[PDB]
Every structure is written in C-alpha cells, then in structure tokens.
C-alpha cells in the first residue's frame, strides 16, 4: 500500500548487501532470480537473497521513512554500495524504479515485481550452538580436505555427525581425510544425526563468522533432525539455509590406524618452510620425499634432468626407518591445518596412509622398537603417500 523509503550509513548497508547477494545464481532462470529483496519495516531493514541451494537473509538497523519492499539487481546493488563514500545512503522507490542517493551521487535503478520472488525457506529448529572462533577453526581445518569435483558429489561435502554435546566433522577428496571432533552446546542432550553439507558454502559461512557472536546451527530437534534437508546457520543478524547433500558418505573411521611401526615429531613451521623450498624443483614430479631414521630426516625433491633439492631436518623418531613420498601441497595443507607448534606423524609402510596430528611445544610423545599405539586426538589429517621413483 506504500512505497519503501529508508536511510542508513553506507558501511552497514554495503556489508549486509554483499553478504546476501553473493549466493545468488550465476545464470538466473528469470531476471527476478538475480534480484535481492529489500524489506523495510518499523526500525529495520531486511535484505533477502533466494537461491535453490543457498538462501541468505541479513537484518540491519535503519531509518525507515516509509515501509515497503523492493526487488533490485543484487550484483549491481553490491557493486554500487561497495564503491560509495562513507555517507548516509538514501533509498526511495518510485513506481518501477528505485533512486539511491549518496552525497552528490545519484543512481536510478529498474525494479522487478516482488510478487514473483520465491519465498526463502524457513530455518529448521535450532540444534545447537558454538563459539564463532571454534566454528571458524574446525571448518577451516576440515574443508581443506574436501573434494572440488562435482562428478563425485559425496566428496564435495563436509560430513557432520552429532551426538549430544559432541560434533564430528569429516571431509576427504580420496587423497587426504580430515577429521575434527569438538564439543558444543546442544539443544537437546539426546540429539543424534548425521548429514552431509556442501563444503564450499559452509567454509564461507565459517570465515564470515570470524569475530562474531556464537553461531547457531539449525537442523531440527529430537528425531526429526535432518528431515527438512536443510542446514540453517545464524548469528550477527544474519541467517542462511543450505540444502544438504543427499548422498552416501564413505565409512572413514575404519581408516584411522590404531598403531604405528614408526612415529615422528617435528617442528611445523620449519617443516612447512623446508617443503616450500625443496618443492621448487618438483613441478613435474609433484612429490617430495622423506628418509626418516633416528634423529633426522632427509627431505628432498627433483630429478637429475630438472634439478634437485634437499634439506635435513631434526626429528624425534621412534620405530623402523622409513622412506616415504608425498604430494607437497597435500602435505603442507595438513601441516597448516594442525594449528599447533609441532606435528606427530604416525606411519606404517611407504604405501599406506600417514596420520598427522597436532602436538604442543610442551609435549614429547618412547621405548622399544615398536609398534606404538596411536595417541588420542581431537584432530587428524590422514594423508596417502605417493609411489617413490624407480
């Protein structure tokens, strides 16, 4: 019955608009689907972005001169608000256009019929919550291992297993497997479910929470958790839904070795630096090699025809000496995921996975020839080796 007119500071407007517009479709079926919906009421502005997969909705304080709603191009609104001066932005809908004024700059954009915009899915009931910094760390640690190939949809997900206060997060691309276990504040003590969430989207949400309020995850409560096929994520006046992957995930737990023929602990920062250096000659081979024995490891790469590189590094070693090779990117991805001063490697053979886990600088994980039991940990990065040359 009335046209929308509101006013608010550029920065508040730009941040909300950007977050909402980013999950809009690449090739919108109809012009309406490229739009973001602005709704002003009372003392607040809602910004809504619908997409089949991911729908996002931000709420910010605003001066509402006149209530109403309007549908405008998401990408254009985002670009404009990002580029404006840090002055108040006036938005006024007249008929089929919306005027956006900021200082001496004036924009006039075409609007689209709000009646044609799909309804955003309702968030499921809250399942639990956790600190933003924990959400950011755990998702960052696991997402690095997720597949990026849509021909294998199951691998593009992060597996989320909930059992009361405990959450287990897992991802793999067939070459590395990352698993993080954490504690959170569960809505119900007897909640129990397992779902599969598109990794790329989840990772973006975890990063965007950084610095923010507690993060609420909404999958439902009791027995009906997961039944809606949606994951809700909310905090900071922002709420989104992500359509779950309806695909079977591999049984990963049976891969985690419980004992090792050799165990090695090293300094993470020094190993990452050394890998970066020797890998400069490994463009063709896509491997670095490690020759472990008591006290030391030879890290090397390359070949006669392209050039060779080597560095010896200190190791706290126990068990059988071992020569083993790795993809250097997959190896430094895992080392970067530990978030600890030191790393423990758990080995069996040169053709079987290596278990990387975090070790503090105040710890020192030995007697005998082996084998050595695996030390309990809340994070693992399990990395397949590659075949050695010859």
């Amino acid at each position: 019955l009335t046209d929308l007119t509101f006013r608010l500071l550029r920065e508040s407007f730009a941040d909300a608009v950007s977050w909402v517009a980013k999950n809009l479709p690449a090739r919108p079926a109809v012009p309406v689907l490229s739009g973001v919906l602005l709704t002003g009421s009372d003392n607040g502005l809602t910004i809504s972005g619908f997409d089949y997969e991911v729908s996002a909705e931000a709420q910010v304080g605003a001066e509402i001169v006149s209530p109403g709603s309007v549908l405008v191009s998401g990408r254009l609104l985002s670009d404009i608000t990002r580029a404006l001066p840090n002055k108040p932005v006036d938005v006024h809908v007249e008929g089929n256009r919306v005027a956006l004024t900021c200082g001496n700059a004036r924009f006039s954009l075409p609007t689209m019929p709000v009646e044609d915009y799909p309804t955003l899915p309702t968030l499921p009931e809250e399942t639990g919550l956790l600190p933003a910094e924990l959400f950011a760390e755990a998702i960052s640690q696991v997402a690095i291992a997720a597949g990026r190939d849509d021909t294998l949809p199951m691998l593009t997900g992060i597996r989320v297993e909930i059992l009361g206060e405990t959450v287990v997060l897992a991802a793999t691309d067939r070459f590395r497997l990352a698993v993080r276990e954490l504690k959170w504040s569960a809505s119900s003590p007897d909640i129990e479910a397992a779902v599969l969430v598109p990794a790329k989207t989840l990772a973006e949400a975890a990063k965007a929470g950084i610095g923010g309020s507690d993060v609420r995850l909404s999958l439902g409560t009791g027995p009906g958790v997961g039944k809606d096929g949606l994951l809700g994520i909310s905090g900071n006046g922002k709420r989104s839904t992500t359509r779950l992957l309806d695909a079977e995930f591999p049984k990963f737990r049976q891969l985690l070795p419980t004992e090792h023929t050799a165990v090695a602990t090293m300094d993470v920062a020094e190993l990452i630096e050394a890998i970066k250096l020797v890998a400069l000659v490994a463009d063709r081979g896509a491997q670095v090699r490690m020759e472990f024995a008591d006290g030391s490891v030879r890290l090397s790469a390359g070949a006669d025809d392209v050039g060779r590189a080597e560095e010896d590094l200190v190791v706290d070693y126990a068990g059988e000496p071992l020569t083993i090779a790795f993809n250097p990117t997959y190896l430094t991805d895992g080392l970067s995921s530990l978030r600890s001063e030191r790393v423990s490697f758990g080995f069996t053979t040169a053709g079987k996975p290596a278990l990387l886990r975090p070790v503090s600088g105040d710890d020192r994980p030995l007697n005998g020839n082996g084998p050595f039991p695996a030390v309990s940990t809340d994070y693992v990065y399990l990395l397949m080796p590659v075949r050695l040359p010859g």
């Binding site: 691998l155 793999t172 067939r174 070459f175 497997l177 591999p250 891969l255 053709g351 399990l382 397949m384």
Partner: peptide
C-alpha cells in the same frame, strides 16, 4: 598416485 583405502572410493 594411490588413493586412501576408502570404502567405497579408493
């Protein structure tokens, strides 16, 4: 370049 022995998956 072998895969992790995932079942299924390799």
């Amino acid at each position: 370049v072998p895969t992790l022995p995932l079942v299924p998956x390799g």
